[model samples]
Target: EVSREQAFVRYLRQRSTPADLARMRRGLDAPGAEVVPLVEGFLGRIQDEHEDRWERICYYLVAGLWASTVSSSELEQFRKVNKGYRRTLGHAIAQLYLARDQSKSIEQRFIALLDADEEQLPYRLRQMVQLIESQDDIRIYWSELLRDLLAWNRERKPVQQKWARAFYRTVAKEETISM
Candidate 1:
């Protein structure tokens, strides 16, 4: 059995010899070996519970990075390589993306972000943002996501207009914060 506790008695008993330190350093020399597992494990445990709110928390956490760039906006300096779907496209777009990539949904993507080393993380995020920016039918795709959440209640008034307005609002906030 494995334990999550960091301070097991085994730690005190198994003090690292200088040779053990040397072996750990050598392991670090390999690509993706050092960080990938630790990050994956830590994030996986957080996700074992509270699975629902994880994505929103991740968005804000990442947004904090963008907000920190206020003076010069280093984040904004990166090319606006991607454009998310337009307001007219609707709100359900994310659901479709979630469905298509069954193996890697938004939740898993956030874990990847946390797991990525400093060098690899930005590239992964850039790839995702660039993908988001490319969709030609934002209005159509987005509406579907909203419909999915609302259970396709046609009885309610068509929400396309309201969502279109909300979409612009969302973009405005992200840009203003330079996220």
Candidate 2:
């Protein structure tokens, strides 16, 4: 069983792991089945504790997991590379659930990710003052926190929509993807 400390550590690790990151940079065909499932689990935990920073960090992990999975964007890229359209259906729809829950513009804050570059993003928390100050959504500028957490989710476009596509593509691409 996972211990409390381990659980906490995992809660943090949800953003990025060095090994996971290196693998992510490989792009398409980079991850195996374990990737998206970890993301799904991470996303659920965050959405469950919507206002908690720790939980929200896990949600970022879910988005970060998108790096390796194929997407509408990737399919276009794939068409050029392999001359084939690959549809990577992800595991959960929690990303939008996460974005929709926010009352502010997460995308606005993340546009300049340097705003939240407090430390190594994975090991770091959302130090963005605007995000911490939010009365409704703690997920504000969530992407700023994952500035380098490419291990799980990487598409920086349509932040919310990307999460949606990534989540679906990753899960559908693999039978084992879960939360």
Candidate 3:
């Protein structure tokens, strides 16, 4: 019988030694921010000897790292580096991200993009609307995002306005105007 709870343990039972567990225990007991380095430390030992095991070890290491921490913000930072493990561990990562959403729609996640720093604004907004899954969400929030973009682009140098206009026009295709 298999379970998600034992997924990593099952992997380890076949391949890992007692020393590996000791290193993991040390990492689990260390400060929250130290978790990634912990995974790297343990992996550093195995990767040189058993190269095929690094990815497998990483998927489980992420689970252990999450199990050790309580902060969503820190966990989110960890996700940025976990794309490699996503195929195997994405469900767990998605669940953690969903929990941090506090039951809001996925579209709501893009709301933060509006407040992103000026230089990153256009690019992040493009990414934001790209991730919006619901039609109703795009309908409601697209204009809000555009309004902020226009506000930020207001009467500026002709050259700057030209770049702003072109960028805004590019994202314009993503916004579907409903009847």
Candidate 4:
């Protein structure tokens, strides 16, 4: 019979070792300064020869669970990378849930997608955010957050609807994408 921790160990391999888990636990419980170092500490190992992509993404998401302790801005540098977009989306959503549950100060989770680049969005990227805001599924809490952003960017054009097209086009692989 495998333990719950062992299940994660199986998927994440070395990064899920008991010692690493213990450190992450401590970081979660620690204060902001201590927690930030833990985020930086794991990030320092990123380009090492044997480190894989998922390992790094998993590490960031783990650290991001403590976002309340660290500065909200600390995550922007990590979010700019193209490879971790999905994982980054997962982490930012989790943080918004926490912020909501805890009544913390950050207003919206989707702000994580904007990062530092405020004034210079491409037309297609701008279109994607608009579509995401306007989506109307009961399953999509993102619509609420998107509505907020849409008001802020109200004068912006809605010409392309970029990501929605690409997103639905890839919908056939739901089984392959399942956990």
Candidate 5:
């Protein structure tokens, strides 16, 4: 069986109407009050009542971010394109950074993203997603991102460390190749 995250994203890709998706996309940078209506019927079905507000907010955030970045044609091929090699947000950012100018600004942004607290994460991540979307080659695993963000506050260090490792490890490989 598919995970709830995967199932929810599939619903957005395959089942939701363009208007529905537009509503979801609106949630990306909006306040929680604005987002809750968008995800209530959809994400609400997947989550238990006991789940906290932040957890539900994560679902909204991922759905919005996905809708904003992925196009209609891309949505149809979402599964095929994302079949293997699930890229973390960090890995995607690193790829974008390396594929571009390898600028210190990009590196600083990544660091700031890693440093972001739960309250600050949505804004930081939204900026990152916009950056990633500008690049053709990079793809983010939205489900995985939702999972990570769900655990972000409690398991902050481990999550940051994992992202850091993925980013630096990719950077390391490129440095080694060029040397």
Candidate 6:
């Protein structure tokens, strides 16, 4: 099941041209109707019998976010170097907080992101992806992100709690080390 999602992302990375990536990146902010044409072909390749509309939407959204944040070159290197590290969206955001300004505003935004509902998630995540892109080293596990977003509705609390733990635990570890 997990490998299926990873395979989809892997196929996308291999097959997508610069132009295709550009179109997918547009899916981050564009309306679904507008973005559907760009991603439908790739979405069709998924063979899951039980996949729902919302899950397909998440695949499109994550693909766009991945394209926007990660360069083709970086993707290659990320695959090679970080194969062992599965960086979640929360962990990436924590890295941002640690590496960048670590201000209260940033913390508040992280909290607000956890508080966000299903309808609010993608937009907030788009903003976070942009913020993460500003940093040099933070990279998210796109397949894991897609899975997490797909589970957002029924597993909202667990997902939120997982992200919260990833964020605060990383922060605390860094702080303890610094001290």
- TM-scores of all candidate predictions against the true structure: 0.21, 0.21, 0.22, 0.23, 0.84, 0.82
Candidates in order have lDDT scores of: 0.35, 0.36, 0.35, 0.33, 0.75, 0.72
In candidate 4 the C-alpha lDDT for residue 151 amounts to: 30
- lDDT of candidate 2 over 63-154, digit per residue (tens): 44434233343233323311111211111222322344532354343333322332343332232222333323222222332432322333
- Compute the lDDT of residue 126 as modeled in candidate 4: 32
lDDT of 4 by residue, 1-179 (tens): 75322333233332444554455545433212233344445446444674543334334333323222233233332353322222222233333333344232322323333431323322222332333323322122122222222333334422112222222233323435658
- lDDT (tens digit, per residue) of candidate 6 on 55-161: 76688788888777653435664466132223567787888898876777778888989888867888888888777787767767787787778777774377777
Number of the top-ranking candidate, with TM-score as the measure: 5
Clashing pairs in 6: none
Off by over 4 Å in 5: 35-38, 70-76, 79-86
Clashes of each: 15, 18, 0, 0, 0, 0
The sequence of per-residue lDDT tens digits that candidate 1 reaches over residues 1-179 is 53322222123114534443343333332322332333233445555665534332232223222222222222332332023333222222343243345225643553453344434543554444434444433222222232222322234434434444444454455456653
Candidate 4: where is the Cα deviation over 4 Å? Answer: 1-19, 28-107, 116-179
Error of 1 at 63 (Å): 15
Candidate 5 yields a Cα-based lDDT of: 0.75
Higher-TM-score candidate of 3 and 6: 6
- lDDT for model 4, please: 0.33
C-alpha RMSD between model 5 and the true structure: 3.3
Assess candidate 6 and give its TM-score to the true structure. 0.82
Q: What is the C-alpha local distance difference test score of candidate 3?
A: 0.35
Candidate 5 residue 56 C-alpha distance from true site, Å: 1.6
Q: Model 5 misses residue 12 by how many Å?
A: 1.3
Candidate 2, poorest ten consecutive residues by summed lDDT: 81-90
